[PDB]
Amino acid sequence: PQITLWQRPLVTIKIGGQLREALLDTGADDTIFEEISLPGRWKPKMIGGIGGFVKVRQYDQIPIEICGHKVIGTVLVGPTPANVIGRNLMTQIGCTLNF
Amino acid sequence: PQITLWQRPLVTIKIGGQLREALLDTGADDTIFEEISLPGRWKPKMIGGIGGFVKVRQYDQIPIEICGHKVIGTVLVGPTPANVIGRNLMTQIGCTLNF
Numbered sequence: 001p002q003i004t005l006w007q008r009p010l011v012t013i014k015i016g017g018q019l020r021e022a023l024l025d026t027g028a029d030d031t032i033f034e035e036i037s038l039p040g041r042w043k044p045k046m047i048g049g050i051g052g053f054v055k056v057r058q059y060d061q062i063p064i065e066i067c068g069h070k071v072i073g074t075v076l077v078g079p080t081p082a083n084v085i086g087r088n089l090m091t092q093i094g095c096t097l098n099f
Numbered sequence: 100p101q102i103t104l105w106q107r108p109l110v111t112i113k114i115g116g117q118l119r120e121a122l123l124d125t126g127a128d129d130t131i132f133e134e135i136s137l138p139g140r141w142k143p144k145m146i147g148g149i150g151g152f153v154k155v156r157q158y159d160q161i162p163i164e165i166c167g168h169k170v171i172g173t174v175l176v177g178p179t180p181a182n183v184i185g186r187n188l189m190t191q192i193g194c195t196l197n198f
């Protein structure tokens with residue numbers, strides 16, 4: 001579908017059997033969620049954003065359903081005021097910016 | 100323009116007679132630049148991002164040309180690792196997300 005930007009670009013997702021809302025964020029290179037549980041090993045990682053850096057866990061090859069589309073990718077879990085779907089996963093559902 | 104997301108969605112803009120590049124960022128409600136000079140009065144403002152808060156100057160009704168389109172809006176100036184064009188200006192150039 002097409003989404004205008006008068007309101008935050010929120011989409012419902014299913015990840016690790018949990019349901020969450022996340023922002024389709026073209027300004028984010030990666031995908032990050034606050035408080036969700038993922039299984040398996042992970043690698044520590046620090047991502048930078050506006051306001052500073054945050055230490056997160058990096059989980060690879062994680063299945064995630066974005067607004068109905070089933071894809072798999074790297075997902076970060078760590079402190080964030082909003083769950084974000086980055087470009088790493090937006091390219092998988094074929095999302096584009098248009099004007 | 101349609102823009103895919105395999106690479107950062109950068110656009111060249113002109114604001115206050117200065118040229119710079121900025122990220123089309125659907126995850127940002129506001130527009131912020133670091134390292135630019137704007138004229139007139141402004142109001143202090145705390146902005147929250149992924150890594151914490153940043154103190155910035157808020158300038159209203161500032162003309163800005165984004166990828167050739169001339170619009171006007173609120174622009175923040177303060178510490179940021181990347182210039183960002185938020186939803187407040189993307190709606191003015193009719194930018195939409197599609198998938």
Ligand SMILES: CC(C)(C)NC(=O)[C@@H]1CN(Cc2cccnc2)CCN1C[C@@H](O)C[C@@H](Cc1ccccc1)C(=O)N[C@H]1c2ccccc2C[C@H]1O
Nearest residue numbers: 027028030047048049081082126127128129148149180181
């Ligand atoms: C991978 C990771 C997710 C850490 N990336 C980012 O946070 C990038 C960082 N770059 C920079 C970078 C840093 C390090 C290395 N390369 C690049 C600048 C742009 N952000 C993307 C932003 O869109 C993220 C949002 C997150 C958010 C949404 C809603 C509520 C809270 C947090 C963001 O920063 N939003 C805020 C925001 C942002 C700009 C202007 C106004 C406002 C207000 C608000 O919407």
